[PDB]
Amino acid sequence: GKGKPRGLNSARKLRVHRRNNRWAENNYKKRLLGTAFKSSPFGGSSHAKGIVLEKLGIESKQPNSAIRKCVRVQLIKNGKKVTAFVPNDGCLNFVDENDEVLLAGFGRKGKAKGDIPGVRFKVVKVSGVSLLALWKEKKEKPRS
Template structure:
């Protein structure tokens, strides 16, 4: 690997010194005529990469100076935000199937969920909050954004008291 790096850097130095364009034949001719012995196979490999749309010289990168790094500033990557409902606060959906999901490790109670086909065409799993429900296939529910932490892949919740999902029943004391 070290030999490869040395040979690529010597080829790049040679091409920059002779002011050569990245043409395959001229690059090969100049490198075979020079004092860099044993680099012809590497040059052939680099020039054969022209078929992929890159010239051999584009594979070699220059180092950036501290001043250039200072001018450019720190590299800040943009994070993609998860938008399960494409930026909408609520979406209507049709229940395809009722599910019982098991939560992640420390928790153990089964969670009641439904597979919903939303009005934007996506099929997602939605959590049903509260105790008890009467949802079946073809029922219509309103879904809002809100992930359930201990259920992997569940990013939306059903809204109680809208369409076919009634309010939770108030439990009386003992």
């Protein structure tokens, strides 16, 4: 019964057949195709710093309704064009075109967060300085 070999000598089959099924698992397969190195905008890196190209007013999905304040960024190490979300009340005024900004993920491990569509990254620093310091008026955006 049970539909799998039980023999004392069936170790190869058991070993290989699990090797064969480990592919139906995302994280595994994601780890062996080296997708983070290849497809992902960061190189699998946790952060990446790019240059701001334009501001976006992205409308959120249903059943929400607002304008979701983001920027298009060209990652330095790639040249990759990625769009990231500037968080908190009016922080989009802290960032400007050709600024350079630190981007990070959204803790969704690839996926987009909340209701903002196609935006899988968030702005953490602009022009060397953190936002939750600019926002809190602890420091000021260096006059460039």
